[PDB]
Structure 1
Amino acid sequence: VKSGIAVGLNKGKKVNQLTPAPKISYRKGAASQRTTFVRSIVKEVASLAPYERRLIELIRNAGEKRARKVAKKRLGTFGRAKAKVEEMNEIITASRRH
């Protein structure tokens, strides 16, 4: 929404805004039956990576803070260490736990 002036938070000119339909591309981050399933096959082959194994053994020990601080190094961004250490937890708790 637009505040109807040059300066402000919402800013600027008032219009009949809506709507552009969501272009097909935008999507992508639907996993979709195929990719998940194939990935779920290729999770049962061929084990974890050697840092991912270092991860869940390190997660069972002093397992957070230390894990993300390692996975930031053995990945790149801290932003992806979130994803991976979070992913590890789900590989810990799904298979081994329960």
Structure 2
Amino acid sequence: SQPKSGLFVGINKGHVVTKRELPPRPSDRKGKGTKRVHFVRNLIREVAGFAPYEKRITELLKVGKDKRALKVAKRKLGTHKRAKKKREEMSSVLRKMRSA
């Protein structure tokens, strides 16, 4: 961000000094999905299949019940952050199949 305002109070309080930009670090790609790993993980999905709750979630996403798709996912996975993401993931799988 822009450096502080030079004043001890208020927005952007603090001591002015030339702010600077930090080069990307390894682990600034941390979590970035990659080709071969995704290739392996997709392939296992057809071989392995779907968990029973993952099957249940899509069914309600197939009816159109977005809320319950999230609400079932949450009681299973535990948190809204993971439940929100898994619903989106099931919705994605649903749109790569029911497209045809």
User: In structure 2, what is the equivalent of residue 76 of structure 1?
Assistant: 78
Match for 1:24 among 23, 26, 29? 26
Which TM-score applies when normalising by structure 2?
0.86
Task: Report 1:17-96 matches (<5 A).
Answer: 17-96=19-98
Unpaired segments of 5 or more residues in structure 1? none
Deviations 1:17-47 (A, max 9, x none): 1122122123212111121111121222211
Root mean square deviation, CA, Å: 1.5
- For the residues of structure 2 that align with 1:84 and 1:33, how far apart are their CA atoms? 21
The alignment of Structure 1 onto Structure 2 pairs a total of residues equal to 98
Aligned residues: percent identity?
Answer: 47
Q: Return the TM-score normalized by structure 1.
A: 0.88
More helix per residue: 2
Mark the runs of 5 or more structure 2 residues left unpaired by the alignment.
none
Structure 1: distance between partners of 2:40 and 2:66: 30
Give 1:62 deviation, angstroms.
Answer: 4.8
CA–CA separation in structure 2 for the residues paired with 1:9 and 1:45: 56
Aligned-partner Cα distance in 2 for 1:45–1:4:
61
